[PDB]
Design a protein around this ligand. Structure first.
Ligand code: A24
Ligand code: A24
Ligand code: A24
Ligand code: A24
Ligand code: A24
Lengths: 103, 103, 103, 103, 103
């Protein structure tokens, strides 16, 4: 198994690492039908989503999607610094695959 | 895809954005039958609900409704500033579709 | 839908509003069989329960009962002021139907 | 229903009350197979478990066991004073049936 | 039934204790398919995983794996000192079986 987010991210196509080293600037979540998602931004303007669950996800990812939204909310509220995001860059906004927090 | 709450809200009929830029003033929740819901108010008197789950909601919204109540409770308790609410205005109190939090 | 806890409470028989405007003084929870419940008290001694789930509860209430115990625990630990409780007064301790929190 | 943890405890065989009036000194939790459990200790050395779910438990206790582990973890992390534990004393470590917190 | 993490760890093949007595330095979590996992590190470089749920795990462990990831996230965010980890050291990074928090 990978030992860090960069190596994990590299195991997938259409991904990249974004380095933020900053707290989340805004947290948005929706219960509207077909847009059951979260969106975060950083003060540099960078915007990321947790995608709506769909046919692109395998069953094992469903619980992890819900956990990621839990993690973003509590990171936002505690002002935790986000080190890196692994995202899929074939989506707009880029779609989060993994998060690392440090400092 | 939408990149913010205003753009998301616009995708739906019978919605509008309320701009609060304030912490929640009160948080109410109920387990009484057929009123399993949350109500929030702001100091300006504005009152909003998370609707009781019902036939107006598709399955994917049910988990998101539960998450929204989780979010309002911890936003309340942490005195997190609510930036905007996307609501359906064909309900009384206006029914929350989405929330954004920012500093 | 109700604008506030008082109007919600009034929709049910055997209910009353208790106005506390105080933090919870003690929190008790049990996993013992047939007593899977929570009990809270206030400084003046007044005691309230979240009832064990049972045949008086409709299915939609089961999730809301679990949420209420979550809410009471974090309210307790954060010393959040409880404004009002809506309770069923045909049970001893009075059984919580809804809670409002406000500063 | 009982008004307090001492009366609750008295409804069961093989139980006793421990009065700690202290924060939890250590929190341990395990995902190891057949030992999916929590263990807490106090400064004086007293040790308690949340038992692995088992055939001695009825279905209504399953959710309550998971909630108890949630409660112990957050009590530990917040240094919340534990007033009393109701335990089964026919297990080693004694098995938690109920907890009360009062500052 | 064990009284502490060391004795629990010793009930399993291919385990060891790590004594850290330090807060978590970084927290990583992923929703990427087949890598639905968490990774933590300490300032001395020690790296640990919560494994992806899989054929090595029995049913009873599934909730406990989810709980473990919850615990590591909140330990990280609260800067809780980790005393010891019980791990399987037949995996790279070593795989967490249990955690103790103290002091
Ligand atoms: O949130 C919605 N999501 C879209 C997803 N689904 C596709 C079509 O079948 C059902 C909904 C959605 C909300 C709609 O609105 C209705 O439901 C809302 C809660 O979901 C609110 O209760 C609102 O007051 C009500 O009018 C109406 C429609 N619509 O009339 O198509 C879609
Ligand atoms: O919260 C309730 N709303 C809807 C649930 N209903 C419960 C009974 O089966 C029918 C549906 C509700 C509460 C009712 O009250 C009953 O259940 C309560 C918990 O729900 C309390 O336990 C209360 O002490 C008890 O009398 C009675 C009715 N009723 O007689 O219609 C409705
Ligand atoms: O034999 C039991 N029930 C029937 C006896 N009566 C039940 C009502 O109280 C008074 C005595 C009985 C045994 C119980 O205890 C058993 O299960 C416990 C976990 O639930 C502990 O594991 C305990 O170590 C174990 O002996 C517990 C309960 N319970 O939590 O309801 C009932
Ligand atoms: O955690 C296990 N629980 C099963 C029950 N307990 C097993 C040990 O004796 C006490 C009872 C268990 C773990 C085992 O170990 C395996 O799974 C671990 C995760 O569970 C790790 O993935 C570890 O790297 C791996 O070797 C192997 C077996 N097995 O081959 O049956 C059981
Ligand atoms: O995260 C992946 N995990 C590996 C499991 N795979 C899931 C899809 O079915 C194939 C097996 C995975 C991600 C993939 O990426 C796809 O899904 C992502 C969400 O999971 C994002 O939505 C991304 O935008 C999309 O391209 C594509 C594949 N793929 O083409 O195999 C695998």
């Amino acid at each position: 198994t990978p030992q860090n987010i960069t190596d994990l991210c590299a195991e997938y196509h259409n991904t990249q690492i974004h380095t933020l080293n900053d707290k989340i600037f805004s947290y948005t979540e929706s219960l509207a039908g077909k847009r059951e998602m979260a969106i975060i931004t950083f003060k540099n303007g960078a915007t990321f989503q947790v995608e709506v669950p769909g046919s692109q996800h395998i069953d094992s990812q469903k619980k992890a999607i819900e956990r990621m939204k839990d993690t973003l909310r509590i990171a936002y509220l505690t002002e935790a610094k986000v080190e890196k995001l692994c995202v899929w860059n074939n989506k707009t906004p880029h779609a989060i695959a993994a998060i690392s927090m440090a400092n």
